[PDB]
Subunit: 167 residues, 2 copies
Amino acid sequence: SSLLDIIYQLRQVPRWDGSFQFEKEDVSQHSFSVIAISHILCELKETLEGKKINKEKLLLYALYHDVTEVVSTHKNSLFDNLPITLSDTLSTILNNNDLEIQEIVEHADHVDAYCKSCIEVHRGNKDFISIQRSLGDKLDNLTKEYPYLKEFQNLFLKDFPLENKNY
Amino acid sequence: SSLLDIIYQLRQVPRWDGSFQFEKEDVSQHSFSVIAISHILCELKETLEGKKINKEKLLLYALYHDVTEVVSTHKNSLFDNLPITLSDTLSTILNNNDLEIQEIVEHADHVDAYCKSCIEVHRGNKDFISIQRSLGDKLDNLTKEYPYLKEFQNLFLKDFPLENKNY
Ligand SMILES: [Mg+2]
Ligand SMILES: [Mg+2]
């Protein structure tokens, strides 16, 4: 199985190609943030909409949401010699039809892109100012239709990144 | 809350300090791999030991297993303005007493360190040969006591990284 190789190969897939970055990020760093953001968004959505979401399937889907970018950058070798318990879980993630999980991860993906733009602008990267504005405007519109995104915005995105890191 | 800031700040925490690396890895890349390895190990352990493990708590624990390294490198600002649903989940991860989850993540942590050594040696880094041998010897001993680690070894660690990436 090439599954473990693909997990580490994601470090070789860059993002934001064509734009100058003070910090070049890869898909593994991006997917790490999307997992964490997906879980936070899901907890907020659970309380606001009065529900419980299966966070196992959500976190696993966010974990592999850009796994196809090892081929197409930014499916038969995965299951080779793979046991039935791993192939079933991998098939459920790869052939997901849970629209709510897809929506949360898509929102988390947009939040991460906006966070990346905030960090670059914070570093002094004027080339990301227009990217931050477009991603921020689209995010503001999403907060009008998804209350859990507005809650996330009020909790973290009002001062990001932190002025003084007092942990 | 500094939670989101800390998630991205983990990119600034290096690993393997004092050793030459062809690819300097950070804690976010490392934690991404540990999450994926923890889930794979858990599925194998479930089938071999005849059980079901709560993968939500496992994945979340692996997600934040090195979150304390934003201060100590390689707790009151986290809960500031944090809602009760997020503080409870964060407290459960930070104050975990599930010994099985801790053991799986500790094993996944050792597997990732060995995988990193394999990649560096594969790149041609002779300085990681002795590290790979020590990590490999300790892993071989663990396979004698934990059958799910031996299964993982047979599935992925016999040819890692892949000679020819045929995806
Ligand atoms: Mg993505
Ligand atoms: Mg670790």
